Amino acid sequence: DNMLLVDDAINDDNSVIAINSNTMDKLELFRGDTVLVKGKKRKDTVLIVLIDDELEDGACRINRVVRNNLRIRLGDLVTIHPCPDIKYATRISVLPIADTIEGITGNLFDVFLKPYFVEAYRPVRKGDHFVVRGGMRQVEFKVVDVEPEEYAVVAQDTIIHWEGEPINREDEENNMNEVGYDDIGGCRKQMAQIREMVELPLRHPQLFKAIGIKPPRGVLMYGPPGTGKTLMARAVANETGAFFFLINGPEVMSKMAGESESNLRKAFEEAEKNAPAIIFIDEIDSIAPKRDKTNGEVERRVVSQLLTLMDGMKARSNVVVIAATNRPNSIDPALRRFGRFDREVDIGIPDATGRLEVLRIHTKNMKLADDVDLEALAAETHGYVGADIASLCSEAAMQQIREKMDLIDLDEDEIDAEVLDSLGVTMDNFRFALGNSNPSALRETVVESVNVTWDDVGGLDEIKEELKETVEYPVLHPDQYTKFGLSPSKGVLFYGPPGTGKTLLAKAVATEVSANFISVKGPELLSMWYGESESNIRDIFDKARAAAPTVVFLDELDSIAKDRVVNQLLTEMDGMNAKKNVFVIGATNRPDQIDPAILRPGRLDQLIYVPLPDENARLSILNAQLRKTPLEPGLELTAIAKATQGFSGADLLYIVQRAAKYAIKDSIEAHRQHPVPYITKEHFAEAMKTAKRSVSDAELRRYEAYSQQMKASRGQ
Amino acid sequence: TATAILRRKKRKRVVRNNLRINNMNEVGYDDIGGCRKQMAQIREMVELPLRHPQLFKAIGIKPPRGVLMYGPPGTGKTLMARAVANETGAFFFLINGPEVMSKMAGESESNLRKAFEEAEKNAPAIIFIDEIDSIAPKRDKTNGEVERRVVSQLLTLMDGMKARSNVVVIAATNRPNSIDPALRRFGRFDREVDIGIPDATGRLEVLRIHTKNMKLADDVDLEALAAETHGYVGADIASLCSEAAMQQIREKMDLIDLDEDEIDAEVLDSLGVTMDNFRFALGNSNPSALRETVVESVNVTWDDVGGLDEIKEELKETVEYPVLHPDQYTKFGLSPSKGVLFYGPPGTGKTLLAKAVATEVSANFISVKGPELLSMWYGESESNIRDIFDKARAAAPTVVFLDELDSIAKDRVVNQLLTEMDGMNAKKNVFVIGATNRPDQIDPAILRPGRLDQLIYVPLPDENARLSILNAQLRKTPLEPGLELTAIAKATQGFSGADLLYIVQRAAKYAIKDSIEAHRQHPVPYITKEHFAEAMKTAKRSVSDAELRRYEAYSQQMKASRGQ
Amino acid sequence: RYGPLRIKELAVDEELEKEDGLIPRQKSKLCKHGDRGMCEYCSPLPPWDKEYHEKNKIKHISFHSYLKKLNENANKKENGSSYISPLSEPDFRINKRCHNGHEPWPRGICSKCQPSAITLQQQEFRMVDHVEFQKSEIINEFIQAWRYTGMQRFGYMYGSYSKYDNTPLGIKAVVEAIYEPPQ
Numbered sequence A: 001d002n003m004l005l006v007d008d009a010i011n012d013d014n015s016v017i018a019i020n021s022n023t024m025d026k027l028e029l030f031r032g033d034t035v036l037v038k039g040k041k042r043k044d045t046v047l048i049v050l051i052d053d054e055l056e057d058g059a060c061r062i063n064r065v066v067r068n069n070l071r072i073r074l075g076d077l078v079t080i081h082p083c084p085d086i087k088y089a090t091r092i093s094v095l096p097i098a099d100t101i102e103g104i105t106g107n108l109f110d111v112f113l114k115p116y117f118v119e120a121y122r123p124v125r126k127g128d129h130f131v132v133r134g135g136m137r138q139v140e141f142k143v144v145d146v147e148p149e150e151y152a153v154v155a156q157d158t159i160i161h162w163e164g165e166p167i168n169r170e171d172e173e174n175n176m177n178e179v180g181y182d183d184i185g186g187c188r189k190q191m192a193q194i195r196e197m198v199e200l201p202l203r204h205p206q207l208f209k210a211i212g213i214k215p216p217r218g219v220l221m222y223g224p225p226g227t228g229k230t231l232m233a234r235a236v237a238n239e240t241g242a243f244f245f246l247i248n249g250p251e252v253m254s255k256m257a258g259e260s261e262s263n264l265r266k267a268f269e270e271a272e273k274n275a276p277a278i279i280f281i282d283e284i285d286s287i288a289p290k291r292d293k294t295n296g297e298v299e300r301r302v303v304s305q306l307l308t309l310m311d312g313m314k315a316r317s318n319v320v321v322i323a324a325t326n327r328p329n330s331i332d333p334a335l336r337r338f339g340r341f342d343r344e345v346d347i348g349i350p351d352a353t354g355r356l357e358v359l360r361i362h363t364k365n366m367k368l369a370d371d372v373d374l375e376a377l378a379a380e381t382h383g384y385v386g387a388d389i390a391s392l393c394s395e396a397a398m399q400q401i402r403e404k405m406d407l408i409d410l411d412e413d414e415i416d417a418e419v420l421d422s423l424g425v426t427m428d429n430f431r432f433a434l435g436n437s438n439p440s441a442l443r444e445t446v447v448e449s450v451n452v453t454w455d456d457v458g459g460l461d462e463i464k465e466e467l468k469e470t471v472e473y474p475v476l477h478p479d480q481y482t483k484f485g486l487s488p489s490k491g492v493l494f495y496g497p498p499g500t501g502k503t504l505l506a507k508a509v510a511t512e513v514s515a516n517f518i519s520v521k522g523p524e525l526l527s528m529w530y531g532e533s534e535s536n537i538r539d540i541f542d543k544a545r546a547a548a549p550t551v552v553f554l555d556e557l558d559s560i561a562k563d564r565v566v567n568q569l570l571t572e573m574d575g576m577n578a579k580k581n582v583f584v585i586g587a588t589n590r591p592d593q594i595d596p597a598i599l600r601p602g603r604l605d606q607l608i609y610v611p612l613p614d615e616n617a618r619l620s621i622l623n624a625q626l627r628k629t630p631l632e633p634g635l636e637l638t639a640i641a642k643a644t645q646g647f648s649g650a651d652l653l654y655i656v657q658r659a660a661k662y663a664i665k666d667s668i669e670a671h672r673q674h675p676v677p678y679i680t681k682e683h684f685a686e687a688m689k690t691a692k693r694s695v696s697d698a699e700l701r702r703y704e705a706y707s708q709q710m711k712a713s714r715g716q
Numbered sequence B: 001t002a003t004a005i006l007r008r009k010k011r012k013r014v015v016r017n018n019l020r021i022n023n024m025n026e027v028g029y030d031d032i033g034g035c036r037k038q039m040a041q042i043r044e045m046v047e048l049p050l051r052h053p054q055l056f057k058a059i060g061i062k063p064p065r066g067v068l069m070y071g072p073p074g075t076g077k078t079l080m081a082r083a084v085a086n087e088t089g090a091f092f093f094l095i096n097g098p099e100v101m102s103k104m105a106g107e108s109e110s111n112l113r114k115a116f117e118e119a120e121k122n123a124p125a126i127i128f129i130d131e132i133d134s135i136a137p138k139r140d141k142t143n144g145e146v147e148r149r150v151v152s153q154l155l156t157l158m159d160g161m162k163a164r165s166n167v168v169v170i171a172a173t174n175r176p177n178s179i180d181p182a183l184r185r186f187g188r189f190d191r192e193v194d195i196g197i198p199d200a201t202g203r204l205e206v207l208r209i210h211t212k213n214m215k216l217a218d219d220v221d222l223e224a225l226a227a228e229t230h231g232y233v234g235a236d237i238a239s240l241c242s243e244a245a246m247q248q249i250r251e252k253m254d255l256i257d258l259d260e261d262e263i264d265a266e267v268l269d270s271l272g273v274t275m276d277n278f279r280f281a282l283g284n285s286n287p288s289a290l291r292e293t294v295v296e297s298v299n300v301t302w303d304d305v306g307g308l309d310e311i312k313e314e315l316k317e318t319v320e321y322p323v324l325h326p327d328q329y330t331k332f333g334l335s336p337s338k339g340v341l342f343y344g345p346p347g348t349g350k351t352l353l354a355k356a357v358a359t360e361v362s363a364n365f366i367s368v369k370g371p372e373l374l375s376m377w378y379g380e381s382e383s384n385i386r387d388i389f390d391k392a393r394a395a396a397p398t399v400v401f402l403d404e405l406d407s408i409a410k411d412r413v414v415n416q417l418l419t420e421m422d423g424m425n426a427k428k429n430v431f432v433i434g435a436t437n438r439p440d441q442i443d444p445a446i447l448r449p450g451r452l453d454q455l456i457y458v459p460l461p462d463e464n465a466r467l468s469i470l471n472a473q474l475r476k477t478p479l480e481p482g483l484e485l486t487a488i489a490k491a492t493q494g495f496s497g498a499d500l501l502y503i504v505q506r507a508a509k510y511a512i513k514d515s516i517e518a519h520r521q522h523p524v525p526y527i528t529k530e531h532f533a534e535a536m537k538t539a540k541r542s543v544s545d546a547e548l549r550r551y552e553a554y555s556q557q558m559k560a561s562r563g564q
Numbered sequence C: 001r002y003g004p005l006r007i008k009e010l011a012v013d014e015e016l017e018k019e020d021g022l023i024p025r026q027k028s029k030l031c032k033h034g035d036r037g038m039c040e041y042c043s044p045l046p047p048w049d050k051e052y053h054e055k056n057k058i059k060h061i062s063f064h065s066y067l068k069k070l071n072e073n074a075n076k077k078e079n080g081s082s083y084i085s086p087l088s089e090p091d092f093r094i095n096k097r098c099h100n101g102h103e104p105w106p107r108g109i110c111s112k113c114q115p116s117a118i119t120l121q122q123q124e125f126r127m128v129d130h131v132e133f134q135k136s137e138i139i140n141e142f143i144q145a146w147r148y149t150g151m152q153r154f155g156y157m158y159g160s161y162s163k164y165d166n167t168p169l170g171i172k173a174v175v176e177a178i179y180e181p182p183q
């Protein structure tokens, strides 16, 4: 109906929009009528309607300036509404753009704007852009202020105040706030959570009045630093169009004694007095740290003031508080109960698709060369949070500049435009930047996503069936468990010789139910045991809960199951709600060494033996690990697999790696002498000659004895 | 006459609205449920001194003034305080803890001074110092000079208050031990009230109170939700209802166009919460009270446990008679026993025996799992043994179940427990029941007279007991018609209760597997005997012969040492 | 209001707010650096510098300079907040409408609508700096009234404000005539 299609207007007028006759009839509009046009990001403008039959029905023509102001592109949809109550601008105060006025002599206003508005009656709104073509020059301007507000018609008698200093252009670009969802990718789930928890309470209050509930107020986003928490909050606030009131932590805590509390009070009062509002308390951990941290009075008064303000806003006011912290345990525990930040959101490192989307978003203004395979970079970059990807792009650009520095004279302050034209990033620059990049997200426990299916694991059909019936059914068919009153199994414990691929089974199980996968290796467990780590078991399980359905994975658990840490783990496992879709998968190589308490019912009770791969499994592993390697045509791996009886997956990977090493050595030698694009069978034969099993026969016999003991324990 | 006060709006269509039949304060007693006893105590301690002061003039005594409520956060302490204050209709001065602590240095004492002075001038008055722990933490917790000035000012004001003036001071704090010890003496917060998590009926009352405005779909089973929610505090129930409504609106959002500020009236009027929404909200929700020791009632009788008739009679003689008939004990002058120690193979149902004993005497039940004991031993748990017994005293009568004593009694914690148990009032009904699978390893000092001296052996379930357990566990599950379990019970000689639970769970697992397979193919609503056979093929004993021999030898030695 | 409030005041305040008042300083003998670049002693002196005043025998800081100090101390540009207004006059009247659940003040008062203790302390900004009489006759005649009669007098004084260079961003009230009410 009113969703007129956007088109490039032939005319350059800043207050004219051409529409088809059919649409004009549909909306009862007419030529010369002033209407309010709304596009995207809630941007609005006032345009004079003109009939033009060339346009197809339902299409409207607008110029470049109006499209830029509305932040919409050609082919978009704009909603047109009547604007009959627009008054004539009593006084319009406008200043030009500095760059556009360089080299202009005489009075700019008389030269350019004086004929533009006289006998024009152009409706102007604050924050708009209008361009005037005078003589041989074209100058853009800004509608700084309009009286009456917020918009009005510039009549002949309207007084135009052009006095003032030039306005720099860089402000609009380098301050690119009002960023929409189009600048964020790879975090659709958390974005949807924040949207459903913020927009609906504000954009459609009547819903909760009809249902009759008090919508939740607090929201607590947390995750690794540099994952774009601030960007997400800013985007949501801008999309909602509410009275965003960013509050920083360091900014508040740097004030004189007796002033930070006043700033907090004034901020909350301002947000309340202009409802709706979205208070965003960035880096709340600096304002309200953990109790065992700083005990000073100045560090206590601020926390008490924040608690009082939080408890004081519980009313009809439409105020939403969003806080961002690195970890859930860093915040004072008093701020995570009812009436406070009771809803949590967890941000996790993106997957390959997320990294590709981030690369596309950042690398849209770069002068990229043709040889760009962004998919390749996304595949090769693992664990890179958004900040790491931005740094990678910057480093690649800098490397390109360095390479092209040969034709650059540092002493000369002038650079030929031709040289700047030749500038262009290449895949080599990106690979160099990847070589020099330093990711840091993985150094701490972090929620991630895995996409491994029942094809990277060879054999183990019975174990796969057991895992399916243990995990897949509870998540996908909870109704059946409710029907039969059977509580879902919490977790399972894998045991077997190292290298059998337990992590692969865990990742496959996580993928099948579409559950985020949390990993906790031995070093992290020991560091927590010694109390010199930045994360705690309570923190790990809080993140698992907030990111449900999750799958926690404990590796080489025997190192700690030899215990205060084990006590905390038991307490957390007892605490977790049964209905919550959180599964703890433990792995160890010496099952009898595990503390018996961990094996009691209601805990990691189910015990699963992971055997060594079979001949067919060996062949499958060899094929899987060699998928992206050039093999000699006609080569069959059946003989090699047969010769590798009793070899775990790690052994086969070692064999493949040695064969590739021989091949690359031969290729390097041949090139240096100046060939062998693939790997010949002789390389594999040499690798097998240099093979060695990783498990002694005695340990295998011990594992088999333990398995037989377990089977007899359940055999009758 | 436990209450004697509760038995008989808010001092107040148009007429009914005016008579009350964002600031809708003055919440009356109707807005509270599941805490009848605590509300009765608070009313008895607040109303009578103010509403009817002539009683104490006539009898010639000074009524108590200091009332201190403590319990898990979110149980509704502030709700009760405000309800009582508004119902009494007296000058109500409200002092927040953090709000007072947020003032500049030197301006946090003047507030207390003027508060108490005003309460005196406009008597009668009620002063509710919410979150007193923030303005009076433990002595060692805070050493800042201002933290001592404020506490000393509070103590001086409290001591000076004691006079004919009709002013009552009420304080709240989640942790009973957090408050400074000096605040719990004569002339100060002497009377103490403990808030416990509600029971099934209390949960239903809370659910009805909160879910009285939602456009609930006609297919709602609030009774089922009340039964399912175990350990849910009132705040948790409110969050559950809010999340269920959120889920309903999210499901309905498909027809709603977010672009338009307004929505079609018909859709807005079609909102309704269904049972599945409550199930989803329960799935998402996560209670927090159980992380720490709390007080909760139990309703297990001598029917959910099979056999153990002799042990049941022994427990009856130990616990029930003194509480129900203390007069005869006074006549004979023999004080009742303090504690009991259950020992035996794991999974025999010691916890069920403790809960049944607690229910018989209508006493509240406190539980302390083994991990809690270890955490207290390592000093990384907020609670403490002194706190446990303080809550047990405040909520008397009470049954404190110390489980897994072997972990600590393999000691600082054992010494603290011994001191606390020795200091227990003789006549106050505070029973301690200890559980341990290693009676030999337990520290002998705990077995001396005046302590957990009464040892009781808990044998493995008998054939009839196993049949009763199996019937009890499987009663709420759809089983095949004409299904026999006597054969399974007979075949399960020497199996512990946990083993029977495992067998039935395996049978249910096979049943659900077959049901899901049929659903995929398309059937199996019952648990056919073939499922039982399949499950039994795998399940097996969990107690070794040596363990049973050791337990029998220990019991026989105990019998020999107790008679000739 | 998403930014500075919109309201019209005297011309003196506007012109004062236009300026910056930075007091330039030259290379101190204590500087160790090239000609360009300034370390800590060659930087321009803010108009509210307390040392400069007490060294020049000026006792208060010329309110406009106080406003500059408050704006500098906070209100980062382009981000960090939404312009919390810097100045607010004291108000000690008890809020008759707070209602956390309590009733009006006469019969109920919480800890949120309780006027906290008031700490008197000598002010540091004087709004009007120099009062200036155009002609000594204005006050000479006023005193002449008492001279003739012997009784005391009292009169309002009319005039207008203007800039005052002698003090950083200072104001002077120039009085043109005196009017005597019936007393």
Ligand SMILES: Nc1ncnc2c1ncn2[C@@H]1O[C@H](COP(=O)(O)OP(=O)(O)OP(=O)(O)O)[C@@H](O)[C@H]1O
Residues within 6 Å of the ligand: B031, B032, B033, B034, B035, B072, B073, B074, B075, B076, B077, B078, B079, B080, B130, B131, B172, B206, B209, B233, B234, B235, B238
């Ligand atoms: N009978 C009830 N028991 C417990 N909570 C209830 C009950 N009825 C309603 N509620 C709700 O439970 C929550 C209790 O909040 P309240 O502030 O009283 O808790 P609290 O932890 O005791 O408070 P605080 O320590 O901050 O004073 C509120 O949502 C109240 O509406």
Ligand SMILES: Nc1ncnc2c1ncn2[C@@H]1O[C@H](COP(=O)(O)OP(=O)(O)O)[C@@H](O)[C@H]1O
Residues within 6 Å of the ligand: A183, A184, A185, A186, A225, A226, A227, A228, A229, A230, A231, A232, A282, A324, A358, A361, A385, A386, A387, A390
């Ligand atoms: N979709 C995105 N996800 C994550 N980071 C992003 C995304 N788009 C851009 N970024 C970049 O990641 C960084 C996010 O910073 P952020 O972690 O929010 O800062 P803060 O420490 O204040 O939370 C910025 O450099 C931003 O440009």
Ligand SMILES: Nc1ncnc2c1ncn2[C@@H]1O[C@H](COP(=O)(O)OP(=O)(O)O)[C@@H](O)[C@H]1O
Residues within 6 Å of the ligand: A456, A457, A458, A497, A498, A499, A500, A501, A502, A503, A504, A613, A621, A648, A649, A650, A653
């Ligand atoms: N089906 C499989 N069976 C065994 N190992 C496999 C299989 N598929 C891949 N692998 C390899 O096994 C290795 C397992 O590494 P790791 O997790 O450190 O040991 P484990 O799996 O014994 O815990 C991986 O590096 C992987 O390449």
Ligand SMILES: Nc1ncnc2c1ncn2[C@@H]1O[C@H](COP(=O)(O)OP(=O)(O)O)[C@@H](O)[C@H]1O
Residues within 6 Å of the ligand: B304, B305, B306, B307, B345, B346, B347, B348, B349, B350, B351, B352, B435, B461, B465, B469, B473, B496, B497, B498, B501
């Ligand atoms: N008469 C009974 N004897 C043994 N176990 C029972 C009996 N009745 C019920 N049970 C089961 O015993 C379990 C409780 O185990 P419990 O004996 O408390 O463990 P523990 O011995 O380690 O304290 C419950 O799951 C319940 O189903």
Ligand SMILES: [Zn+2]
Residues within 6 Å of the ligand: C027, C028, C030, C031, C032, C033, C037, C038, C039, C040, C041, C042
């Ligand atoms: Zn210098």
Ligand SMILES: [Zn+2]
Residues within 6 Å of the ligand: C098, C099, C100, C102, C109, C110, C111, C112, C113, C114
């Ligand atoms: Zn108030």
